Amino acid sequence: KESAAAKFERQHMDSGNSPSSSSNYCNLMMCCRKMTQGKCKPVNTFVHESLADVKAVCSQKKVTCKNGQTNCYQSKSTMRITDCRETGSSKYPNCAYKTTQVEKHIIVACGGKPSVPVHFDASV
Amino acid sequence: KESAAAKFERQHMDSGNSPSSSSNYCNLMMCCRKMTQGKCKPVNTFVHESLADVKAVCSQKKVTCKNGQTNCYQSKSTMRITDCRETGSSKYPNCAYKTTQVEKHIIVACGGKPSVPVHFDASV
Ligand SMILES: Nc1ccn([C@H]2C[C@H](OP(=O)(O)OC[C@H]3O[C@@H](n4cnc5c(N)ncnc54)C[C@@H]3O)[C@@H](CO)O2)c(=O)n1
Ligand SMILES: Nc1ccn([C@H]2C[C@H](OP(=O)(O)OC[C@H]3O[C@@H](n4cnc5c(N)ncnc54)C[C@@H]3O)[C@@H](CO)O2)c(=O)n1
Task: Give phi and psi for B100, each to the nearest 5.
Answer: -140, 120
Contact B32 A29 (CB under 8 A): no
Residues 6+ apart with CB under 8 A from A45: A81, A82, A83, A84, A106, A120, A123, B12
The experimental resolution of this structure, in angstroms, equals: 2.0
Method: X-ray
Strands B79-86 and B97-104: antiparallel
CATH fold for the domain made of B1-124: P-30 Protein (3.10.130)
Ligand 2 center to B5 CA (angstroms): 44
Residue A79 is given by DSSP the state E
Helix (H, G, I), strand (E, B) or coil at B61: strand
State whether residue A17 sits within 8 Å of chain B by CB.
Answer: yes
Report the separation in Å between the CA atom of A109 and the middle of ligand 1, taken as the mean of its atom positions.
8
Helices and strands per DSSP (H, E), number in chain B: 3, 7
Is residue A111 less than 8 Å (CB to CB) from chain B? yes
B10/A34 Cβ within 8 A: yes
Instruction: Kindly tell me the sign of the dihedral angle through the C-alpha atoms of A56, A57, A58, A62.
Output: positive
